[PDB]
Design a protein around this ligand. Sequence first.
Ligand SMILES: NC(N)=Nc1nc(-c2ccc(CNc3nc4ccccc4[nH]3)s2)cs1
Ligand SMILES: [Zn+2]
Length: 349
Amino acid sequence: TPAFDKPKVELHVHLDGAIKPETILYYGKRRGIALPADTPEELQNIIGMDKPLTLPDFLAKFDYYMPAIAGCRDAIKRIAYEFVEMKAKDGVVYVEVRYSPHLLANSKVEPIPWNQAEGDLTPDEVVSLVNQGLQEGERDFGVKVRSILCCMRHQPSWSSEVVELCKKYREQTVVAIDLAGDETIEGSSLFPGHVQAYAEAVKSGVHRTVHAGEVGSANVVKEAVDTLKTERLGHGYHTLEDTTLYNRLRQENMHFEICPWSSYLTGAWKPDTEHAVIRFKNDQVNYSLNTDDPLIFKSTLDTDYQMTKKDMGFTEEEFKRLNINAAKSSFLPEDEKKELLDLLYKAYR
Ligand SMILES: NC(N)=Nc1nc(-c2ccc(CNc3nc4ccccc4[nH]3)s2)cs1
Ligand SMILES: [Zn+2]
């Protein structure tokens, strides 16, 4: 019934769109914040979409619930532990999971998100708290888990507190820096706070990932590669608009973090046309399959493989190939990965 019953790797999914309805009220309703609702069953259908909204429709979704968990310590650790638990029900042996500390914070961060007031919920406490619930999740649900912390494009002021959090919490449990948010902002990749954060990353050996080529042209993908020095791309569908960049990522073994079901609802991929991942799969690309914002997309990893089985023709050696290139591209330290790759060869034949 589920498209591909075997174990899985996932590398692109955001904490703060992978929170449950239910604990959206429990913190919501405890905290009064208060929502479009009071059933734990109909947040879901409002802050979950069915069809391609726009950018502002989309960010406004964050506005109802985010203010219910950010700010409250209890809920930062809650959503950590509960996240691990979804991945095991999805049949995932390794997940890298991501988020911005700033967006959980309530103290120590200009500007203050989600309209909230002051506080003592620090950015650094947020990372502390997330690590926790992540770890109790590896031990309870038996998924191995690392995190990535996420620069916001519009906010290059944060970025250096970012790379530094990434060296503070190194291995316990953060493996990488990300860049995200809205790739529309002209020359965002190239803001000095973004560039120096990634340079520092290189200096002190944090890994690197970048969201690019999703709603954004190929030149944003070339700046992620050549200036920011990433080792993998968040999405990168626009790489195909630029063939020489292509042939070279293809020659370089770049890994692309695909969200196919995300690519519909966001507008990244058009209904009429070519699917980026079919092409990437006719060309034997280094890519992976990924959920992204499962709240907001009303979905599970099975949504994604279903789609790919049930339209774009995926055999199941695809499925296996792609989960192999995924733990190959992972940001596990070198023993750890060989160990993961083991698990998966055992399971796959
Ligand atoms: N959990 C996540 N994704 N964090 C954050 N993401 C933003 C993002 C802004 C623009 C993004 C990419 N562009 C984008 N445009 C969209 C239209 C419809 C649905 C989704 C969309 N995402 S993600 C703000 S905070
Ligand atoms: Zn993303």
